[PDB]
Unconditional design. Sequence first.
Lengths: 303, 303
Amino acid sequence: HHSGLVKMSHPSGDVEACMVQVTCGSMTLNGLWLDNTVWCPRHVMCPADQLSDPNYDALLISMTNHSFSVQKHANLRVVGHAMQGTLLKLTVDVANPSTPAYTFTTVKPGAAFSVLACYNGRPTGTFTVVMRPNYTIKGSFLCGSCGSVGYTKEGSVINFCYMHQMELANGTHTGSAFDGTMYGAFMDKQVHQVQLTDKYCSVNVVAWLYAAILNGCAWFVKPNRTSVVSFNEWALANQFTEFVGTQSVDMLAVKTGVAIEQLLYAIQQLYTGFQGKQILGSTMLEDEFTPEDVNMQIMGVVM
Amino acid sequence: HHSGLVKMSHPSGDVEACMVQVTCGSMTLNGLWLDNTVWCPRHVMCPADQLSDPNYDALLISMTNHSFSVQKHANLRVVGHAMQGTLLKLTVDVANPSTPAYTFTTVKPGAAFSVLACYNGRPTGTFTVVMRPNYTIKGSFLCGSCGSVGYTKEGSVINFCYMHQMELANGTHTGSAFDGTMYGAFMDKQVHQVQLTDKYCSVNVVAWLYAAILNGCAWFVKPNRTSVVSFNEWALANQFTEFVGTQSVDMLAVKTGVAIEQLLYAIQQLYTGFQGKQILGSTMLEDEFTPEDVNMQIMGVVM
Ligand SMILES: *[C@@H](O)[C@H](C[C@@H]1CC=NC1=O)NC(=O)[C@H](CC(C)C)NC(=O)OC[C@H]1C[C@@H]1CC1CCCCC1
Ligand SMILES: *[C@@H](O)[C@H](C[C@@H]1CC=NC1=O)NC(=O)[C@H](CC(C)C)NC(=O)OC[C@H]1C[C@@H]1CC1CCCCC1
């Protein structure tokens, strides 16, 4: 049996119209064009002979307006350049006539968002990730993908949340929000950086366990219950996030008649072992599906 | 460690511009607008009091040109209507000025393609599936999603391959190619239909095992080998597809220096059990990644 759950990305058309190629002469990557502004990673200024110990303050001052070349696949003339954290804020003489209604917002661990992977300013693929507890993502990026963006949708509004920056030693990825900061303690310098331990997203595992009940799978549901407090205390010594309920999870407890605490108890049992059984055709806990994904794809309820 | 493999969909912008709402007065679903043609499922003609034993020949003849209402979110006037298998071929007075360069092609088991799930003609999400051996897909569709399309991309050309039709008893899905036929032995009637047994896609499991080597995981690679012939004979009594090599798999054997047959041997071993070990963080064989996905996402090689 199939759960009816796939990794669902938002449609990318609105964002595709906002991608440009930006280059300083050394590195080439992608930028986000909205109104008279183009956002892109700041290591576009870096020479390849300094990606490990660059001084962006000094590189920026060495830049003038015509040090930046912005192209769409037209040519946009840069009339103003500024640095905000790990991003550049270039100003162009032409506003993107296809600019969507948009906002900038930070994504939190567990939540999902859609990524548009681009190269040379040309969109090449879209996928969806969940922000990991250690503020990385398990994406699919190669060289020249920096500036590829990540976004959630609320109605006709694009909430931009992620501009790709770099890959870590373990194959995962991370980038900056559009306020300038990197997620987690990372720095956009090509050196060894300590990575924090990842954790199972407790809320997303509950959403998954609910998704299994909505498909007729509920062998794990025992009448026993574990309080959120007792679960969170347990979660800290077991590499689980701490659980925080929502209306989206509450709606999933109403439809199934299964209490959140019954499933918290279930997660404690399953963590020690599935006892050879399968859940949605899996023998390990899944935490890459949000309550919203389950509500949307299975119950048809967007909120 | 992370494999750098995600379920990568093509960007959907070109297809979004080709989606319309079509209705006959009873059911509402989605249609594909290309040039002066709009394709949509034929059960849009069905009254809800006959989805189980409809006569489409009789329903079609009961239809005239103004029985069909096509909308984009303009209004397209229908000037010609015809039925091809399980699809309708409506002709409208206006050609889609955003028509991409496109072809119609049938997808084969194991291969992947990108789906644009739409509702009321409004694109709502995109994902990617692999055509299962039993000619179903493990998608995410609800009511009103019929007409949602599935497509592969070769350069700047959209190869359309799937128009969604229905869901089966087990939660999986299937639809028609744009020649009119349904994939597999299915019929677009809302009755019980025998479903064939699914199988592991041998080629996609090899691609996955290669993907694991490209990430430093190769505990399963033993010098032992199994010939394709011996593997295919084994596959028929074990619910595996029969393996057929390609330049894309050959390229993956060249990069890793691991022979295809070594991995065929490995699949026979792993099928009996992983012995408690993990492959790319999994304890079951993965067959939802194609050799092309691995070549593209990990080696950066599109072909
Ligand atoms: C975009 O230009 C690119 C994206 C990378 C390249 C391949 N996959 C990706 O996700 N970003 C970078 O190259 C940045 C540039 C710096 C100025 C920030 N750096 C990297 O991502 O470099 C690759 C990182 C992983 C290797 C360094 C490694 C880390 C552990 C310690 C040993 C060295
Ligand atoms: C699009 O209109 C819709 C898509 C379905 C609805 C929910 N998820 C989907 O993928 N398609 C249909 O409703 C078609 C219409 C017929 C005229 C072909 N039929 C269905 O998909 O009906 C749902 C199927 C599964 C239930 C019937 C079930 C099958 C096993 C035997 C008992 C009855």
